[PDB]
Amino acid sequence: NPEFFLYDIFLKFCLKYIDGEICHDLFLLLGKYNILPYDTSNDSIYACTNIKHLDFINPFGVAAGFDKNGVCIDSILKLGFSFIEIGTITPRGQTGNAKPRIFRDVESRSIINSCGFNNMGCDKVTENLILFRKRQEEDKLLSKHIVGVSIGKNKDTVNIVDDLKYCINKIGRYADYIAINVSSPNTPGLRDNQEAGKLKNIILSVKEEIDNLEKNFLWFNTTKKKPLVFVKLAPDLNQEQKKEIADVLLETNIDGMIISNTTTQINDIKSFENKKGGVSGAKLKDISTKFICEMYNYTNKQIPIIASGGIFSGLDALEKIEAGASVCQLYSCLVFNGMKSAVQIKRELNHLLYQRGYYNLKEAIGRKH
């Protein structure tokens, strides 16, 4: 498309001279005024995918933390993504940790960030999403797109479940699915909530609040159904903990599990030495894919997987799919490849299934095993 490629020229300049968050702000500003490129081409019906009754028109979305406030949904989706996960949001607004809090190593295609759940808050983001859903009702290019909401807790909150209830009660009826973020490394003490008991109570409380929205049309979202419940897991756990978690998720009946968030155990990027925050990008790819393989077995194939971590190429995506993933989220690939990310990776993925003899994307899930 003539429009996508023009932004590629500025991409290398930005990654070299401009601060990361200015780049983020500009991208949100471009999309706010609908001057970002569009991809209105039909997607391969053999590349479509689904999680339960959620039907994704293609297997690529944008991971949480990119449009943390839902102010740029239309333009991002129209870049060629099937869905976007907004958030992570909290009940009360937060400015996050001090800036600068985002750093990029172009050579390794890696990012380290210490944002700290900066967001307008549930109320304002809820307003933004309500505005999007109204625009969705009048734009054909948005009728089949999916919007999930990642929810979290304020830094000063003590109990996580209390904050999760507020988000569900206010933005729950506008979300196609809810992602439980208990894996951020930039808010103290959160990852400790991944212990089985606490995670079990979290999932039941989140699933209880969603089911209770009906009791007290209701679903002003894409599906017209109640939102599914997903959990995003951190990769820095030992094997016994992963086993407990798998047992919890299945027992609690989780609709899916995102794998994964950022990691804190990587220490071989020279420009990131002595910096706080979680690391994203290519270096996280192989680590995350194994977390899927492990969890996919621990779950006995009964819990769908959503892949997030170092996905840059169509083959990187098929590695995630064949490992057990049903859909993929991008974040760093967007940062380092830009407006063309979705078009390039969708074209590459279609080329791949053709050579490998697959009938459709569904045939590839877990074929690695």
Ligand X SMILES: O=c1cc(C(O)O)[nH]c(=O)[nH]1
Ligand Y SMILES: Cn1nc2c(=O)n(C3CC3)ncc2c1[C@](N)(c1ccc(C(F)(F)F)c(Cl)c1)C1CC1
219 binds ligand Y (CB under 6 A): no
State which of residues 54, 93, 102, 159 lies at the interface with ligand Y (CB under 6 A). Answer: 102
Q: State yes or no: is 75 an active-site residue.
A: no
Per CB under 6 A, does 213 bind ligand Y?
no
| Backbone phi and psi for residue 29, each to the nearest 5 degrees, phi listed first | -70, -40
Phi-psi map region of 202: left, alpha, beta (phi>0 left; psi -120 to 50 alpha):
alpha
Q: Draw the binding track, 67-106, toward ligand X (x: CB under 6 A; -: no contact).
A: ---------------------x------------------
* Count of positions (residues) in the chain: 369
Q: What is the DSSP string of 91-156?
A: SS-B--SPSP-EEEETTTTEEEE---S-BS-HHHHHHHHHHHHHHHTT-GGGTT-EEEEEE---TT
Instruction: Determine which one of 75, 184, 288, 341 is catalytic.
Output: 184
The answer to whether the annotation marks 117 as part of a ligand binding site is: yes
| Pairwise CA distance, residues 227 & 289, whole Å | 26
Where in 331-350 is the site for ligand Y (CB under 6 A)? 334-335, 338-339
Nearest approach in angstroms of CB 113 to ligand Y is: 6
Among candidate residues 153, 128, 136, 152, the one with its CA nearest the CA of residue 69: 128
Q: Does 110 bind ligand X (CB under 6 A)?
A: no
Q: Which does 11 bind (CB under 5 to 8 A by kind): ligand X, ligand FMN, ligand Y, none?
A: ligand Y
Is the CB of residue 179 less than 8 Å from the CB of residue 87? yes
Q: CA separation (Å) from 158 to 9, 39, 186, 187?
A: 46, 44, 16, 12
Contact 330, 60 (CB under 8 A): yes
Could you list the residues that contact ligand FMN (CB under 6 A)?
63-65, 68, 87-88, 102, 111, 113, 115, 150, 181, 232, 261-262, 280-281, 284, 308-311, 330-333
Closest CA to 59 of 368, 354, 347: 347
Residue 186 interacts with, from ligand X, ligand Y, ligand FMN, none (CB under 5-8 Å by kind): ligand X
**Residue 330 interface partner, choices ligand X, ligand Y, ligand FMN, none, CB cut-off 5-8 Å depending on type:** ligand FMN
Among 60, 103, 117, 230, binds ligand X (CB under 6 A): 117
Residues with catalytic function: 184
- Name the site residues for ligand X (rule: CB under 6 A): 65, 88, 113-117, 181, 183-184, 186, 261-262, 278
